[PDB]
Structure formats: C-alpha cells, structure tokens
Design a protein around this ligand. Structure first.
Ligand SMILES: O=c1[nH]c(=O)c2nn[nH]c2[nH]1
Ligand SMILES: O=c1[nH]c(=O)c2nn[nH]c2[nH]1
Ligand SMILES: O=c1[nH]c(=O)c2nn[nH]c2[nH]1
Ligand SMILES: O=c1[nH]c(=O)c2nn[nH]c2[nH]1
Ligand code: NA
Ligand code: NA
Ligand code: NA
Ligand code: NA
Ligand SMILES: [Xe]
Ligand SMILES: [Xe]
Ligand SMILES: [Xe]
Ligand SMILES: [Xe]
Lengths: 295, 295, 295, 295
C-alpha cells in the first residue's frame, strides 16, 4: 500500500476580533470560524509513525490566533491568503495550505435612528465564506461565496413545458411559489502570490456586494420559467460585472410549497386561483446546480 | 393505576398563507409552525382502548388548515385563540386546548430603494411565538414571546463584586464582551373569551414591537453591572408600558468570549486593555432567568 | 415591579470521568452534560446591582468538576443529589438547587467475542437523564428518564373506531406501521435528604433497566389499538414493579409512514395488503402524552 | 457566458421498504434517504428557458419509489446501480446519473433472548452510504462508506516527537484519551455495467462488514502513535482483504478531552497520572485525512 493523498489540520476554530477607533469611540467586531488543512512531505507520519514532520494541529490553532492579532481579518480573501502563505513559507516540507473561513454576521444596531458605537445584532444566518488554496509554486486560488440566503416569492414563477412520460404526475403551472436557500460561489483568476492579492483588495467586498445585489434583484424581478433559467441570468450578470472572476456556480434547493385541496370540506375552494393556504414541505426538495464560465 | 393527566394532538404542522390585495397587487405572506394538544374526557382511550373519544390527530391537522383558510392568521394571539376555542366548542368532551404557534420571518425585500410587491427574505431566525391555553369555563390565557434574538456588545459590560470563596477562580472585570440569545415572554391578563381577545387585537403587535424595542435599547445603552441587573431593567420597562401584561419572564444565556494570552509568543500583548482577539466558547454557558410581576 | 421568581446557574457543562481498576486493568468511562440552577435570597442582584449575593456561574462550573473528582458519578440520581445538597449547605442564602444531568452512552466494545478493557463505542443517541430538585427543608425530589429511544414495528398496530365528523379524512386501519421516539419519566417519592437517597442507591439502575425492558417488550408484543392504549400498558407495569415510584409519564411522537399509491403507473399495486414501499413523513407528527399514578 | 457544468435532480427522498416472509412470518425493513442528480444535454433549460429537456425532479422522485417497488433495495450498491442505469437508458439526452444513498439502521429487537419477527430499534446514528456514478459509455463507479461511528479509548494513545517551534505550546504525552467519529470510504474498481455489478453482489455486504470490523479492532488494539499512524494501519488491512477495492479514504476528527488542573483547590491532584475528571471540548477539533491506494 501507498499514501496517495493526505491532508490534516484544525477545524472549527472560532475567532472574534474587535477594532477600536480611539478618535471616534466606534468599535467594529468580526467573528469567523476557520479551518486550515496542510499538505506536503508528511507521508512518514502515516507509514512510519514519524511525528517529526507534523506541525501539531494545536500549533495550527495558535497560529490562527497569532495571525489574526497581527493582521487585518477583513476582507476574508486577504486574511485567508496571509494565513495560507504563512504555512508554506515557514515550513520547508509543507507545500500546500487549504484555508476555509466562514464569516458570521454582526450588524451594527440602530438605536433611535442612529448607529450604535459598540452594539450588534446577528441579522440572519447568512454567511460569507472563502476557500483559499495556497500551493507552493502555483500561487493562490480563491473561491468566494455567500450561503444561507433564504428567499421566497409568492407569484411570478412558472413551470410548464417539461418532459411528460409514464413517470410523470406533475401538473404544468403558470403561477407557483418559489423559495430557495442561495449558495453562490465565484472563483477568482489565479493570483501569483500575496502581493497580487493585496493589489486587488478593494474588489473583494465590492464583488461580494454585487453578487448579493444581483441575486436578490434577479430573483425578485424575473418572471421565472424555471429555477434553471433564473439562476443562469444571475450568473451571467455577475460575470459581466467583474472581469477577474472566471466562473460562477450556484447550488439551489427548490423548497416546495404544496396546494391543499379542501373541497372535501363544505366545498371550500383552496386550489389554483383560489389557493391561499399551503403546506410547506420539509422534504424531498429539488436541487439545481450550474457552473457558468466565459465563452 | 389511574390516569392523572393526559393530552394529545398534532405537532409540527407547517402552514403558509398568502394575502393578495387585488387593488394594489401587493402580496403579504405568513408562515408558522403550529402545535395543538387537547385535554378532556379521554381517559378511556388509554385504559380501555376506547377510540370513540379520540378526535384523530390527522383531523386536528385538517382543522388547522381549514381555520387558517377561514380566519385571519395575524396577530398570532388571535389566531391561536380562534383555533383553541373551536375545539372546546365543537367537542362536548374536550375541555382544554393548548395551542403553540411559532411565526417565521418573511420580510419584504427592498429592491432599488422600493418595497417589492411579492418577494421576501428570511432576515434571521428570530421567532415570534404564542402559547394559548383555552380552558372551558376559565377563559383564555395567552403568553406571547420573542426568541432567537442574538446580540453582542463589545464593551460597557462589567462584572465585579461577586462572592469569592475557595471555589472561585473568576477574576473581577470592568470591561468585558456581553452576548446572549434573548428569550422574552409576556403573560397577558386572563381573557374571558374570544370577544375580549378580539377587543384587544391592536395591542398584540404593538406590545411585541415595544418588547423588542425595549430589549434592544436597554441592552445597547445600559452600562451593565451583570446580566441580572440589565434584564430586570428590561422587564420593568415593558410592565410600565402595557398595563394588560401581568408578568414578564426573561431567559438569557451568557455566551462567553475568552481572552487569549499570547504572551508566550514573542511577548505579544493580547489581554486586558490590549485584548483584540478572543475565543468564543460554545459551552458551557451561564443561564440567567427572572420573572418580574407587579408590586 | 417585583421579582416573582429567579434562578441562575451554568448550563451545558460537559464532564468525563474515568475509573481505573489497578487489579484487573479494566477502565470504565462516564460522560455527562450537567446544568445547575440556583434559587434563594438573590433578588438584590437583579434590583440593586448587588453582586455580593451571586455565587458566580464560573464557580458553579468549578464545583461540578470538584464534586465529580471527589464522589461517584453513578448512578446519576446520587451524583445529582450530592451536587444539589452541596449548594444549599454551603451557602446560607441559597435555598434550592436544580440539577439536570444527561448521561451519554459509552458502551464497552466486544473485540473477537471478549469485552475490551479500555475501548468504547457510542451505540445510539439514547440518553439516561435525571432532574434533581434539592429544596432546603423540603428534601430531594428526583425525576429519572430515558429519552431518544427510537423504535419501529412494521405490523401489529391498528387504529380504528375514532370519532368521524366533517373534519375527518383519515381511513380506519387494521394494519399500519408504528414508530416513535420514547421519552419516559418516572418520579420517585420525595426523599428526606442525602442519607435516604444513599439507602436506595441499588434501586436506581435497576428501575432504569426495568423501565427500558418494559418499554421495549410491551411495544414489541402489544397488538396495539392506539399509541394511547399501548403507552398506558407500559406505565402500569413500571408502577407495579417499583413501589418507590409515584408517577410515570410518557411523551410519544407518532412518526408517520404513508402508503404510496403507484396505481397510476402501469397499475402497480402498492396499497393495503400490497403495500411494500412507504414514504416516511418528517412532519407533522402526532404527539401523545400521559401521566399515570397510583389509585 | 457559457454553461460549463450542470446537474439537477431530487434530494432528501426518504424511502422505507418492508419484506414479508409468508412462510416464517418474519418481516425485515429498510430505510434510506436518496438523492439523484442527472447530467446531459440540458444546457438549453438554463440558457433558453427550454423545459423540453427537463425530466421533472418530481418525476425523478416517482421513479425512485417505482424502482424500489420493483427491485431489491439491498445491497445499496446494487440498488444505486439499477437506479442510475435506468436514467441513462430511458432518456437519450441524459448521459450521467449520480446516486447518493444513506442507509439508516433498523436493527431487529431481541425480546427475552429471541429475535422479534417485526420490531426494530435504531441502535445509533451510524450510517452505511453509497455514491454511484453511472456515466454513459464509461460504466459504473461506486464508492461505499460508513460514517457516524463514534468511538473512544481511555488509554493506549500517545503523541510525542512532533515539530516544536515558537508556535508550539502542546506538551508531549505518552497517555491520552483518543476519540473520533469515523468516516471511511472504499472505492471499487470501475464496473462495466449492471451485469458486472450483479456478479459481485455478495462482496458488497461482506466488504462493509470487514471495513467495520478492521476499523474497530485496529482502534481498540493499536498502541497509537498518532491518529495518522493508526488510520494508515486500518486502510492497509482493508486493501489487503478485498482485491476489488482500489483506494480507501479515512477522514477522522480528533475530538479532544482536556485535563482539568484542580490544584488551586486544596491541592487536589487531577493531572497526569492522577487525571480522573476531564473536560470534553466541542471545538476546535483536529481533522486528519488520508487516501491509501495500491503500490
Ligand atoms: O494524533 C494526533 N495527530 C496530530 O496531527 C496532532 N496534532 N496535535 N495533536 C495531535 N494528535
Ligand atoms: O395511535 C394513534 N392515536 C391517535 O390519537 C391518532 N390520531 N390519528 N392517528 C392516530 N394514531
Ligand atoms: O452577568 C453575569 N452574571 C453572573 O451571574 C455571572 N457569573 N459568572 N459570570 C457572570 N456574569
Ligand atoms: O424550476 C423547476 N425546475 C425543475 O427542474 C423542476 N422539476 N420539477 N419542478 C421543477 N421546477
Ligand atoms: Na514550504
Ligand atoms: Na367542550
Ligand atoms: Na442554604
Ligand atoms: Na442516455
Ligand atoms: Xe476574526
Ligand atoms: Xe400561516
Ligand atoms: Xe461524568
Ligand atoms: Xe428503502
């Protein structure tokens, strides 16, 4: 037997950082969950019980806190690139670092119409994520994403004209509820190293904001022919607005809301144009994915 | 042996309702999870296999949908009171109905600065809940609550002057992070029946909004001496603003964020006044409760 | 305003203890999650910011570890009683302690037919729990429970003869699937104090084992007329076997498995006597409760 | 813009099947959660709103139930291969099917020492899974796995000799607790089609049982030098026992249990050789992966 692939590290490292403006008194908080996995010349820890090649996962944890102390933690694309670069530069035998960051929302509270200097609310479980792969000699690959963005529209969604055969019971419809949890990922062109990532720092927050805005606007305004058609429109627009993105991937559940026929009860009308009360279905769910790139 | 207490019904009934304004084209959605448990002269179903006394839980489910079709579902205090009253009036041998409703957030989207007519976003997992107990001959008892409201302040929290003995290691502090998930419940005076609940309908949404506002403002503005002291201030204010409330209960976890001593690493300073990076603790957590009533 | 009720303490305290037999080399592990909430003369911490009455929740955490170091942690009824008694005896102004313990399964592994001395497996998420309320001058009240015991029988369950009216669509049946998650609680007679709890130590594990055995056997063997009827039979038997139990409470979801009509597809027969493939329903679910006591 | 990749289908389809032996009266149940995603010539549904190429996800759901009615559902490697093959053969424009199956445990109850004919218990949340990729012209690729197998050993684990630098605080140890949740995957050699999968049917259950047995025995018996070293020993043995496996992958969290220094309290000794009470850590956790193949 032989080791074909190996990676190891520390997962679920929760980190909070506060920034204090001494001039204005305003405080800003950041909270993330971080995972770092390393690869390199470490096969002997597996095959020969040679621990001398192991940077202890406990030390990886320490390094995450130290790096957060000494560097900005925002945008997460930059922090992830700093953290990954550290490992490949510090340890001769480590040749790749894989950094995953989930950013949790702490939104400044408005109290009596004004922004509070040091009080925050978690408005939704929507996350902003990054995956950063730093590979010695091959630069830095960054995938940015938003996830956990849950939306619903109560009309202006259709689904008709699909394949009908002996396995089909679904009725065609010209008016249905459409609800999904949005997972959208944009993959940046490969960067040569940290200097190049630093040069593009302003683009990271701007592209996240654009991706979010395009997602919400397109969902709200499209008279949707299907999840497939609406999601493609989203992806097309993001690629048009940021030339440094190579691909956009969406993964969308179709969270079904079923009509409830109540006609057995005193002829009550609750279907088609008369439908008011629906039964949300926990499962099963449609799952629709697409990756869109440039011509 | 004897049956001392019994209740049975249907839990986890998901319900969505849409309201369509034909004039303006504006649609409004409501989504809830409902549980109804019944009590009454049903002991023989347990002791004698006498199913003739059982309103099937499946029928309870049907009734929830029918009631939602025929009545307003908002405010939830009213819907719960209608639903509970139905069971005690329809079935001679059922003498109490217990209705729990969890309301999920569907917040209208703003697209380009204007409210969208039919598109919604789940902004946070904060819930608005009601528990309604309808008891034949004893009226309607309603407890309203908000839950899952997660907040953090990065300064203006203290904790010193507590009991110190041989079990104590905690250091006194004059500046710490305070973070909690708020669970707040207000209990209404007993109502004589549905007519009286209907008479107070406008107070329900208003009191929910007040409870939320008082909670957020007090948390943000109090230079907190402890969770105990800050929570009491919240409860006192809610009781002062709504005379039809008899008690207010808060249940608050104290979600700890620990300082990380980094001084072992090149003398890095990250404690006390120099603390910037902290480790959020998943567990254990403080749990602080209080019920506040009138003199 | 006035404080009507208050309690505070530490939740989610995870504890592991190992016992090492130096003679045989055999090790035995215990793992629990513990919550302790205190009550007493503590109103001033809420109303006057008087922290001098507060035993810090951090100190409560320390006390749990110290108590586990110095005492047996099994049976959990005994450990909970020791822990609760500690607080009311040590602190003059604390008059009640409420201790909740969840015990997690670590079952010794069998390797090649023999019990391994120090290796364990988590066989199921079934828990054994206790709630211990220690109240100064009123003794010790203990509720013991098992929870998370998930079972299914594929036949020998019926449900017919229930009330039928204009809200009813459910068909009567003489053969259905019955599946539930069992939550069963037995409440002990009040104990005068720790000496009395110690005197009954052997009964705690024995009664847990009996409750479990009676639950499983009755479920498997009863040709069930309803959940109500089968659960009553369980409760009756437990009360008959342990005279020191005052009441038994069961709370049982009815986890539905629906027939799937496939007759639209080439006349395929999959209902009634021909039913082979079913659709488990995540929600809604029946919820059936009963508390059984002595004549 | 262009579609680079697309797949769509139905997730979270819960399925139960019962087998009834008319001779013996013995019933056997199977319960699974199934996901099927399709690929093929479907780009126009995304780019042109051409729904004519879409096999509706609702129809995919129907097909899963029909296929389960007409075929054995065990071993899951066979069921997955039948289900995937169906889609690529039935639809000219569908060229790949991806089938994921999670099998839930329903273990026959022993009542009074004998196996019950129709009563079952969920003993643990351990799962047996398969991923089956059926690609037109390239055969059938199957990955089998077990997951959610949670184990702990209280001694005979060591970790010393790792890299020490200015980021390291971890102490070397010759005796620690080792606990993990096992995720193990074995990848079969590519099969040419369904006939070949059918020819190997007996190997599927046997290899699952072997993988499980080797995992448990190795964990219990190895005086572990590290997670890395112990996991490699497991993988090596599985590859030696089943020649039709090409690779074995393990992904193992290192779930930490920390010593608690109690010496501040009356000199209580609870570290090193005196350690009895430990604090399980929910997070962070080590994460160790390896893929082992043939020379
Ligand atoms: O088994 C281990 N492997 C590791 O890589 C490691 N790092 N810290 N502790 C550890 N334990
Ligand atoms: O066992 C049952 N008890 C009930 O009360 C019920 N109601 N619907 N189905 C049922 N099954
Ligand atoms: O606000 C607090 N209240 C308490 O009771 C406590 N105990 N430890 N830390 C604490 N913080
Ligand atoms: O938008 C949809 N896309 C689909 O592929 C589908 N299949 N069933 N319903 C559907 N809705
Ligand atoms: Na390197
Ligand atoms: Na009545
Ligand atoms: Na006392
Ligand atoms: Na095909
Ligand atoms: Xe952070
Ligand atoms: Xe609703
Ligand atoms: Xe324990
Ligand atoms: Xe199945």
């Amino acid at each position: 037997s032989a080791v074909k692939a190996a990676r190891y590290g520390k997962d679920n490292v929760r980190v909070y950082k506060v920034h204090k403006d001494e001039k204005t008194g305003v405080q800003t908080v950041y909270e993330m969950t971080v995972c770092v996995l390393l690869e390199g010349e470490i096969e002997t820890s597996y095959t020969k019980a040679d621990n001398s090649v192991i940077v202890a996962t406990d030390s990886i944890k320490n390094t995450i806190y130290i790096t957060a102390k000494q560097n900005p933690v925002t945008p997460p694309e930059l922090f992830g690139s700093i953290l990954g670069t550290h490992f490949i530069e510090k340890y001769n035998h480590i040749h790749a670092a894989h950094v995953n960051i989930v950013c949790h929302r702490w939104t400044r509270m408005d109290i009596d119409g004004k922004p509070h200097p040091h009080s925050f609310i978690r408005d939704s479980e929507e996350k902003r994520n990054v995956q950063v792969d730093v590979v010695e000699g091959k630069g830095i690959d960054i995938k940015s994403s938003l996830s956990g963005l849950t939306v619903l529209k109560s009309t202006n969604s259709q689904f008709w004209g699909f394949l009908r055969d002996e396995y089909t019971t679904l009725k065609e419809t010209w008016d249905r509820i459409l609800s999904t949890d949005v997972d959208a990922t944009w993959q940046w062109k490969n960067f040569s190293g940290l200097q190049e990532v630093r040069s593009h720092v302003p683009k990271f927050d701007a592209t996240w904001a654009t991706a979010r805005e395009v997602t919400l606007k397109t969902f709200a305004e499209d008279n949707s022919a299907s999840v497939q058609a609406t999601m493609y429109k989203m992806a097309e627009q993001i690629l048009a607005r940021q030339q440094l993105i190579e691909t956009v991937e969406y993964s969308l559940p179709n969270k079904h809301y079923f009509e409830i026929d109540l006609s057995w009860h005193k002829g009550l009308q609750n279907t088609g144009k008369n439908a008011e009360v629906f039964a949300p279905q926990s499962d099963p769910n449609g799952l629709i994915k697409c990756t869109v790139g440039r011509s």
